[PDB]
Design a binder for this molecule. Structure first.
Ligand code: NI
Length: 341
């Protein structure tokens, strides 16, 4: 059944709750972003109102074939009324079209639902500055102090420098970058820009990127693989056997592959700086795992929460085990006692 942490009290609203059939009492289904664990259950057969960003609405219409009459896109940073309740959608700094949602309850309570987010100090000057938040529904994916990672800017600098060096030393090297969802588009875009190539990809993935309102996208991507030296492949294919195979397919145009797997956190973060990361190599294939995250580090999450000072926190991630739930509740209490709220 629908878990309590997907229900917004005092409304007829649910958040990222599409895989439980008709939720008893739900008059509007909000969708925070287009990632499969969140939209799971949506299709062309859905006949309830869906509220979301413009970009998520593009993906719903073109990828899932949801009928236009049920898609209700809202602008960001704009006070809107939905079934008699004031809401605002805010940038979540996650993947394209991802939003946090502010609900202003008729009784006077204010609820923020982060969806998935990578907390940033820029949020401290959004519309959130302007009033008090009583209840926070929080993306706790990385809520433990072992989870450090570098800025997105440092990671892209490493990737650009690595790729440019490799291809300038060998003009017959091909660059490959893995993907299995929207998000992390900067990694392949920034690499293609430094090399003066378009990024080449399958028709299905090109279709996906063309829904994301990225400016000048027609100049940056293509379905003609032959004309491109940065290829995107399914994440599953980013291994020595799948890459060797791919190399055969390029018909002797290339004699070397340099590949990137943008992961989330991995345990080598707890020892190694970005400046010191190395690849796994077999023959003329090298695979780099780079810690490009679109979730909050432990320190970023903690800063956000200590700034916001909510009265109650409801985790939405890692809620399935008692050990995880108890660990999270300990950190919450530490933070409250240190900051004084
Ligand atoms: Ni996500």
């Amino acid at each position: 059944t629908c878990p309590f942490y997907k229900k917004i009290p005092g409304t007829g609203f649910t958040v990222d709750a599409f895989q439980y059939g008709v939720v008893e009492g739900c008059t509007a289904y909000f969708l925070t972003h287009f990632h499969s664990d969140h939209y799971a259950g949506l299709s062309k057969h859905f006949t309830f109102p869906v509220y979301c960003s413009e970009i998520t609405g593009n993906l719903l219409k073109n990828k899932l074939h949801v009928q236009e009459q049920y898609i209700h896109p809202l602008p960001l940073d704009t006070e809107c009324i939905v079934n008699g309740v004031k809401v605002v959608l805010l940038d979540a700094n996650h993947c394209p079209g991802a939003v946090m949602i502010l609900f202003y309850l008729p009784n006077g309570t204010v609820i923020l639902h982060t969806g998935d987010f990578r907390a940033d100090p820029s949020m401290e000057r959004s519309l959130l500055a302007d009033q008090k938040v009583h209840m926070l529904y929080l993306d706790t994916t990385y809520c433990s102090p072992e989870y450090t990672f570098p800025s997105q800017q440092e990671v892209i600098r490493f990737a650009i420098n690595t790729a440019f060096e490799a291809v300038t030393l060998n003009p017959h090297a091909l660059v490959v970058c893995g993907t299995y969802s929207i998000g992390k588009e900067k990694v392949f875009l920034a690499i293609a820009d430094v090399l003066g190539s378009k990024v080449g990809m399958s028709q299905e993935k090109y279709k996906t990127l063309q829904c994301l309102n990225i400016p000048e996208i027609n100049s940056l991507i293509t379905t003609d693989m032959c004309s491109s030296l940065v290829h995107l492949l399914p994440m599953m294919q980013i291994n020595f056997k799948g890459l060797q195979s791919h190399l055969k397919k390029c018909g002797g145009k290339y004699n070397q592959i340099l590949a990137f797997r943008p992961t989330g956190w991995t345990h080598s973060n707890k020892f190694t700086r970005i400046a010191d990361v190395i690849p796994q190599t077999k023959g003329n294939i090298s695979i780099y795992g780079i810690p490009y995250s679109e979730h909050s580090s432990y320190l970023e999450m903690k800063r956000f929460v200590q700034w916001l000072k909510p009265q109650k926190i409801i985790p939405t991630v890692n809620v399935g085990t008692w050990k995880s739930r108890s660990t999270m509740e300990k950190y919450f209490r530490e933070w409250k006692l240190e900051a004084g709220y």
